[PDB]
Each structure stands twice: as C-alpha cells, then as structure tokens.
C-alpha cells in the first residue's frame, strides 16, 4: 500500500512558538494530502485540501506545503485554542488511508504530580477482589512510569494504565495506578505500595498503606 | 443543514455482521460519493470503504476488503455499508463522510462529516456496572491533601457518566476515560481535590450507567 | 517495427465529464492485460506510467463550463507527456480517461508531427465551443479547442491558455456520428469537416467508408494519423459501460475493420482510447464486456489481424 507516517507522534511547543508537523507518505502522491483537525471528543474538521489550499474559515495560521512523497503542515503561531490532532488524508483513487495523528499540546508551569494510593474497598471485601489505586494528578510531562511492590517484589498482571488528555484549564495530565487483585492475594500482605517516576521529582516517590489500617 | 445521520448497530459479540446507515440530507446526494472511516475511541482514524454517485467504484481498505460492503440508495438518500464477519478489532465509532465537491470524480477529500454509530465487537451483554470504590479520604495516612476517588468495574458497553456530588463539584475532577477490562468489561474512575479540614463534603460519587440504565451512588465522606 | 512500437500514456482522469468514474479506465484497461497482449505482437510496448495529475482544490466554472481549470492543466502534462513520447519515435497510446484529454493527446501529437490527420472514432461530434455548449462539460469540446477555423469562437478560457488550435478543418474525419447536436451539427456543415455519420457508413459499408477516410487523409500527401477511438462510437451491445451510449452504432466488426485498415497503412501515429466507464456497467459482465471490446479495438490497431498473425519464421518444421 502506502503508508503514511505523522513525523512527530506527538509534540508540544508553546503558545506562541511554531509547529511543523510531517507527514512523509510511501510512494508519490503527487499532491493529494488534507490535513485534519479533531480536538478530541468532536468531529475532525478539513483544514488543507491539496496541500496548502487553506480551506474557507480555516485560520490563515495554518500554512501546509510540500509535494510528491513528503509533506509539512507548518502552525505558524499555536494560539492554544488550536490544540488537537492532526491527521493526513492521502485522498487519491482508493487506498485513502490516514496517518497515526500528531498530538499537539502546550506547556505550563512543569509540575510534580501529586502520587497518592489507595486501599481496596471493604464493600469490595465482601465481593472476593482487591482493588488499590494509585492516583497521580497535575503533573507535566506526560513521562511516568508506575511500580507496584508485593512488600519489596515486583508485580505483573495488575499495573492497570488509565491516561487523561490534557486537561482544558490548567492544561494539566492525570494517571491512575489501576491494580485489581484476589482476596487469597490480598490479606497475604499489607504493604502496598506504587511508585512514581517523574522528571520533576528525581526520586521515586513510593507510597504504601497497612491493610484495615483505613 | 448537511445532517449526516448516522443509525444502525452497535453491540455485536461474535464475528456476526450488522448494517449501518447514514440518512443523508441537505444536499443532493446522487451527487456526491460518499464513504466511510472509523475510529477506534482514542485512536487515529482509518478510511473504511468508499463508493460513487452510482455505486460500482467501491473501494475498500485492505483490512475490510472481504468483510465489508457498501451499497447506496440514491433514491432514498442512505449510506448502508454492510459488515461481515467481524474480526472484534473492529469496535470502532464509525463516521460516514462526503466527498467535499460535486463529482465524485475519484479523488477528493472529506468536507462534511455525521458521528456515531459506536460498533462494539466483545463477548458479554449489557449490564450493570460494579462501583466498588473506597478511599480513607481523609485519613492520616501519608499526606495532609488525600483526593477522594471512585472505581467503576465491570460495565458494558461504552459509555458512563459520573458525577460528583450531583454535578456540582468540578475542582480536580479528572474522570479518568474507561479502559478495557481483561475481562471483557471496561474499567474507569474520577477523581475529586478533598483536604483533612473540609467536614462539609458530603460527596456522592453519581454513577449512571444508561446502556443498562443503572445508576449507583455510592456515597462518600471521610471515615475512619 | 517502427509502427506498433507503443509508448502507453495512462491519463486517469475525468474531470472533464460531468459526475464521473472514468478515470479508472486505465486501470481497468490494464488490469485486463493491455501491456501484457501487446507483447505477444512484435510490439516494443514501453509503459510511461499513469500520469499524476496534480489537483486543483478551488476550481470554478467559467460560464458554464464545468472544472475548467483542472481540465486545461491535466491536458497540458497529457500534451507535454505525448510529446515526450513522439520525440522517442513511438506511438503515443493514451489510454483513459475522456475526451477532454483529447485536447492534449492531440496538442502534444501535434507539436511533434504537425502535419497529423485526425480520424475520429465518436458517436459525438465532440465539437461544441463553449459559447454554444448546453451542459457545459469539457468532454464534449476537444475538438473545439483544436480546429484552426475555430479561432475567434473560443473564450479565454482558464486553463486552456496554453492551446494553440492544431488541426485544420480538413484534417479531421468523423466515423460513426449518431448523436450530433444542433450547434454542434452546424459547426460541422460550417467548417466542411468530412464526416461519416451512422448514415453514410449504412449507405456505404464500413470498407468502403474506410476507404473513402484513408483516401482524403493520406491522398493528398502521407501524414501521422491520430485515431482518436472513443468507445461509446461502438454500439451499446459491445460497448455498454460508457459515459453516453447512443444505441445503433457501429458493430464489432466495424469497429474492428476501422483499427485494421487504419493499421495497414503504417501511418498510425497516436490513440487514444477514451471513455471506458467501468462505473456504468449494470452489471460486472457489462464492464468485462465493454473493457475486451476496447483491448481488442487498441490490439487492432497494433497488427492484430482477424485472419490471423505469424512471425517471419518457418513454421512448418
Ligand atoms: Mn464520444
């Protein structure tokens, strides 16, 4: 076929600074490339039609070029109401096939989350699970990775990922440390533990709690 | 004006099939050749198929080529595409399109867009959620600033609403998009900004579950 | 030889029709074994690719004349192609496509051989100007953007700038005409364009209007000709899956015996092959049908005799 690639899988520059998005296709397309916009949770609305193009109503910030094989889509300024991904149409007779997106984003103030654990439910105690959360909010970059520690071992099958999108105000991120255990595996240990890995906080943060100790 | 009204499944377990429809109207629809994409929730877009202003230029991605198939009725201003023998990596929303000029001339891009129509493919029914959060919020566990949380587990299909204390705190509150189960059933949460000296937070953790139409509250406040 | 030594132009486009699905006629065209039957004859088939036709987004009728812009540029990179392929000494088979490329595959073919005499194969006159044109479409006006008597009578149109009208009045022939409107039909009386209508060719037998054809083309002086086949000239029965069937045109056979005579001269410089629509077929067996008819035609007028083709070999040991 031909493989579109997005050359950023996702960035974030400023508001204010220029974003150059790439979209290198696999063989000559020959200026068939839209560029789209979806800012999650709509519909993508067209920005470029044939590579530059400027769709009517399209802000005349967005100024896409190139021809043949590789193709940009230059954002002159991010104007942060223009935060969302991007897609890469490749319309021709019938492969038609998008690219992976570009995740656009700004930054704020860069902060360290806030890593806080919890135990499982009693109401769940009476279920036969176990269930202990691990919740880590406001923090930036988006790079943590999470551990959990059966009281110093490691753990598989229970790291659970739950992401947030950039939050609309502070523009801020959010994990869940999602763990889901048996009652046989639950009342073995107590102290339970998830540890942080962020660029803010050189140090791991780790965090236990002591079982019926809640 | 363009109204690109997506209807049809939604909810099919095995490698069944179903048959979508998007009820066209405001332009003349013999005209303009329209197609379908999907999308997985969170992820990229993909072109499904596309078709003429007549039908028999259907083109179809190499993931669908055997599976699916398009028909139009120009008479009647539909978009069904059939869908055959699902392979459950195909529990995308699927969009229906239009072709952005008057043609159909082969190439062009997609101008107007309908929503909707989530397919889901799965191998449970429809049922209640199991909300079986607690939190010792706040306790003097670690921090002087415990958030307050609830756990949504076992629900189908996509989507739920939580609210908090009636919808009416919204400080902090980052409901955490629903995640696949290895069960089958899909796992979510929400989040509130609580501190030890807060004793006028009564917060009920409204979860709604329309698919089945099942709510559960499971009300918090900060115990032993 | 240096007849049937092709260079095949694909030209997948259709912007000048109205709401079209001809431009996979070259794809169609080929994946039926276009290049791969040309191979059995001697033929020195070089393939210069389907050309990539740049797109034009915001693209506006002139008066009434539909997408002009995209028309005009596909068929200057179609004329610019052509006679890149001319200058290789080969014949420029353009297959695609409609005839509003037909523009280009003869502004090209005429760069090169400017003396070239057009026999065009069309149940239309193709003639219309854009002043009296009545559904504004660009594949019923290639001819009009060609024919030096025509000066004066053609708009600056956007696009077709770049045109400079090639063929006289005198060197075009007309076979099969059977759908000819009135401003088209009194341009063709005007200028003295020879045509043979659906009528002549009852009154007269395919061979001998053939005859008639080859012998005001090449009777006067041998000269290139560019046999620009359109396949709804053929009848409905053969040629179904095509833009505008008018039924009771000419046969199989006919069609068969033009492409041998105009062959047998050595002279074909060029074709064009327009007009496939496998869109609409009403069924798959229509587009197989009308797609063998338009390979057969093209494998014609390449040396493909119906009584039957040998090398100069010795086949009797
Ligand atoms: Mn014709």
């Given at each position: 076929?031909?493989?579109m ?28 490339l839209?560029?789209?916009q ?37 954002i ?6 223009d ?8 319309y ?13 984003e700004i930054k ?8 806080s ?20 909010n ?12 059966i ?19 502070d523009?801020?991120?959010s ?40 | ?14 490698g ?7 009820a066209?109207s405001g ?9 379908w ?8 877009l993909?072109?499904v ?5 007549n039908?028999g ?8 080529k055997g599976?699916?198939?398009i028909?139009?009725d ?17 529990t995308?929303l ?23 129509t ?18 010792p919020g706040?306790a003097?566990?670690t ?15 996509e ?7 009636s ?11 629903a995640?696949?189960?290895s069960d ?5 949460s929400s989040?509130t900004?609580?501190?030890s ?28 | ?6 260079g095949?132009?694909?030209?997948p ?10 431009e ?19 033929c ?5 690719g ?9 693209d ?20 610019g192609?052509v006679?890149?392929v ?9 297959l695609?496509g ?8 003869i502004?090209?073919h ?10 065009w194969?069309?149940?239309?006159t ?11 479409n ?34 075009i022939?007309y ?8 401003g ?6 005007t ?6 209508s ?23 002086k ?6 620009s ?5 053929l009848?409905?029965?053969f ?20 492409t041998?005579?105009?062959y ?7 074709l ?11 069924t798959?067996?229509?587009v ?23 090398k100069?070999?010795?086949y009797?040991?």
């Open positions: 076929d031909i493989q690639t997005q050359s950023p899988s996702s960035l974030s520059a400023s508001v204010g600074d220029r974003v150059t998005i790439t979209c290198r296709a696999s063989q000559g397309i020959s200026n068939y839209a560029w789209y979806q800012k999650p949770g709509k519909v993508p609305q067209l920005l470029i039609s044939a590579a530059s193009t400027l769709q009517s109503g399209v802000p005349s910030r967005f100024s896409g070029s190139g021809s043949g094989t590789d193709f940009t889509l230059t002159s300024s991010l104007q942060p109401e935060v969302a991904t991007y897609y890469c149409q490749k021709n007779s019938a492969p038609r096939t998008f690219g992976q997106g570009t995740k656009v704020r103030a860069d902060a360290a989350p806030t890593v654990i919890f135990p499982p439910s009693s109401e769940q105690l009476t279920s036969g699970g176990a269930s202990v959360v691990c919740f880590l406001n923090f930036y970059p988006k790079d943590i990775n999470v551990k959990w520690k009281d110093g071992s490691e753990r598989q099958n229970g790291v659970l990922n739950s992401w947030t999108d950039q939050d609309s105000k523009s801020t991120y994990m869940s440390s999602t763990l889901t255990l048996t009652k046989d595996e639950y009342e073995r240990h107590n102290s339970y533990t998830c540890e942080a890995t962020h660029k803010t906080s050189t140090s791991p943060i780790v965090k236990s709690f002591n079982r019926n100790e809640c | 004006e363009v109204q690109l009204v997506e209807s049809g499944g939604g909810v099919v377990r095995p069944g099939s179903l048959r979508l429809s998007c066209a332009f003349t629809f013999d005209d303009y050749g329209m197609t994409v999907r999308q997985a929730p969170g992820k990229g993909e072109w198929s596309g078709i003429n202003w039908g230029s259907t083109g179809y991605a190499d993931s669908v599976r699916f198939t028909s139009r120009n008479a009647k201003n539909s978009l069904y595409l059939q869908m055959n023998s699902l392979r459950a990596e195909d995308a699927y969009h229906c399109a239009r072709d952005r000029r008057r043609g159909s001339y082969g190439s062009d891009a997609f101008d107007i867009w309908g929503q909707g989530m397919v889901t493919v799965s191998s449970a029914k429809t049922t209640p959620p199991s909300v079986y959060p607690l939190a706040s003097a566990q921090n002087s600033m415990v958030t307050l949380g609830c756990l949504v587990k076992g629900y189908f299909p989507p739920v609403t939580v609210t908090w204390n919808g009416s705190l919204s400080s902090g509150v980052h409901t955490f998009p995640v696949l189960e089958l059933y899909t796992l979510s989040v900004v609580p501190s000296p807060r004793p006028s937070e009564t917060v009920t953790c409204n979860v709604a579950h329309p698919a089945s139409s099942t709510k559960v509250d499971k009300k918090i406040v900060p115990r032993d | 030889a240096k007849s049937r030594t092709i095949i132009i694909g030209a486009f259709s912007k000048g029709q109205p709401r079209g699905g001809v996979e006629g070259p794809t169609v065209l080929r994946k039926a074994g276009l290049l791969e039957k040309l191979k059995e004859q001697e020195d088939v070089k393939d210069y389907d050309l990539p036709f740049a797109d034009i987004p915001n506006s009728p002139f008066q009434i004349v539909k997408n002009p812009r995209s028309v005009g540029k596909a068929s200057e990179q179609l004329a192609k006679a890149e001319k200058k290789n000494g080969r014949i420029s088979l353009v695609g409609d005839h509003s490329l037909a523009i280009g595959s502004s090209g005429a760069r090169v051989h400017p003396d070239l005499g057009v026999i194969v069309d149940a239309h193709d003639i219309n100007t854009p002043l009296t044109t009545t559904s504004g660009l594949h019923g006006q290639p001819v009009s953007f060609l024919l030096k008597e025509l000066k004066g009578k053609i708009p600056d149109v956007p696009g077709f700038s770049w045109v400079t009208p090639c063929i006289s009045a005198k060197d022939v076979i099969g005409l059977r759908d000819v409107d009135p088209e039909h009194y341009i063709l009386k200028l003295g364009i020879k045509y043979f659906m009528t002549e060719v009852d009154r007269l037998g395919i061979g001998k209007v053939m005859e008639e054809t080859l012998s005001y083309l090449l009777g006067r041998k000269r290139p000709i560019h046999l086949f359109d396949v709804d000239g009848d409905p029965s040629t179904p899956a095509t833009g505008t069937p008018v039924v009771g045109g000419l046969t199989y056979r006919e069609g068969l015996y033009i041998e005579e105009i047998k001269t050595g002279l074909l410089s060029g064009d092959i327009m007009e496939v629509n496998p869109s609409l077929g009403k798959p067996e229509e197989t049908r009308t797609v063998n008819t338009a390979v057969a035609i093209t494998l014609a007028c390449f040396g493909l005799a119906r009584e039957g083709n040998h100069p070999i010795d009797l040991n």
